[PDB]
Design a protein around this ligand. Structure first.
Ligand SMILES: C[C@H](O)[C@H](O)[C@@H](O)[C@@H](O)C=O
Ligand SMILES: C[C@H](O)[C@H](O)[C@@H](O)[C@@H](O)C=O
Lengths: 104, 104
């Protein structure tokens, strides 16, 4: 599939709360993520830098992009603004990373 | 397997060279990485921050740790000191990330 990686940020005082909110995430959000073709979605926390390293395999660029249009992702992102920096539309501040090495 | 993620840094002026050196990496280093149980070793570059987010699945913590004792990893790391921050023993400056979310 298409390997995608990106990085987001997290509030310095919300490391524990951010993690707790993903164990588990809302069942309706999980359903939507899976329906939209995501696989092996993993997020890692860089405690010293308040950074979140995410990796996810998706079947479709467009479908993955469509998650932002769903109500559940929208309310999820609104909900998450209290623990991490977000863009005006409530999507988390994020940057796409460039794959430089891959060894199966 | 055991999912491991860590972050390293890269010199601001060596983004292109760092990537070129991994396509492909030395064949004897690949052989050693695989012999020591590494799977799906991926490294992503954060251009804005000069950061390298890496993720690798390994069969054994001890075997993975043993890679640093091999001559090839040692000469590889000595070689890489010219493009990225390194510890006195030449291993790259690195920090273990904490997995906070995982959706198969
Ligand atoms: C499930 C995942 O969290 C979501 O896909 C991301 O956009 C971000 O909100 C995570 O905190
Ligand atoms: C193959 C890989 O590069 C190695 O495992 C890391 O320690 C670092 O040197 C990479 O640049």
């Amino acid at each position: 599939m298409i390997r995608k990686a990106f990085v987001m940020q997290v509030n310095p005082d919300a490391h524990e709360e951010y993690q707790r909110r993903h164990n588990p995430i809302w069942p309706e959000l999980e359903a939507v993520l899976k329906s939209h073709g995501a696989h092996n979605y993993a997020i890692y926390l860089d405690k010293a830098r308040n950074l979140l390293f995410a990796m996810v395999e998706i079947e479709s660029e467009e479908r993955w992009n469509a998650v932002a249009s769903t109500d559940v992702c929208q309310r999820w992102w609104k909900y998450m603004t209290d623990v991490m920096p977000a863009n005006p539309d409530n999507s988390p501040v994020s940057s796409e990373l460039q794959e430089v090495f891959y060894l199966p």
